Amino acid sequence: SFSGYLKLTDNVYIKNADIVEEAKKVKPTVVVNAANVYLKHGGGVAGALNKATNNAMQVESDDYIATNGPLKVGGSCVLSGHNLAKHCLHVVGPNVNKGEDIQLLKSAYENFNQHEVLLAPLLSAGIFGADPIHSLRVCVDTVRTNVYLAVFDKNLYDKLVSSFL
């Protein structure tokens, strides 16, 4: 199971880790992807998860978009986890660098409540432009299921833990 996590609340845990490496080690039931509405996994967490699947995540995602159209900001879809997990929950957090409504971050985290346990990144953090401290607060105040957060950046992980109210 998950090892080396710091417990923040009854249901939220955090670790300084690369989520791709964490997924390959744990092979959790659900890994969360920091997706965009088009499921174009170019950079950040999505690019790293897709590259780990040898682009199979992108091929599956393009077929999903061709059939269903784009996701909504704040929405999600469940696809295969390929070699990383049983399932990948592609969740679209608001991209602040695209002027998307930061209020949609709570709706994005609500998707996690449909899964008993998840390995996830902080939504809208990184290249999505939101404040990761704010993302962690929305996470602990919205998610009720067991969420294991993987924060790639050590300096950000330390800042998140030391500032956690």
> Distance between CA 133 and CA 138 in Å, rounded?
9
Q: What b/e sequence results for 130-142 when a residue is b if at least 16 CB atoms lie within 10 Å of its CB, and e otherwise? A: bebeebbbbbbeb
Give the resolution value in Å. Answer: 1.1
Q: How was this structure determined?
A: X-ray
8 A C-beta contact, residue 132 and residue 139: no
Q: CA-CA distance, 156 to 34, in Å (whole number)?
A: 17
Compute the radius of gyration of the chain from its Cα atoms. Answer: 14
Rounded-to-integer distance, Cα 31 and Cα 50, Å? 12
| Cα–Cα separations (whole angstroms), residue 130 to 76, 116, 135 | 19, 26, 7
Phi, psi dihedral angles at 16 (to 5 degrees): -85, 105
- List the domain range (segments joined by +) for residue 138: 1-165
Number of domains in the chain: 1
In three state form, how does the secondary structure of the chain look?
A: CCCCCEECCCCEEEEECCHHHHHHHHCCCEEEEEECCCCCCCCHHHHHHHHHCCCHHHHHHHHHHHHHCCCCCCCEEEEECCCCCCEEEEEECCCHHHCCCCCHHHHHHHHHHHCCEEEECCCCCHHHCCCHHHHHHHHHHHCCCEEEEEECCHHHHHHHHHHCC
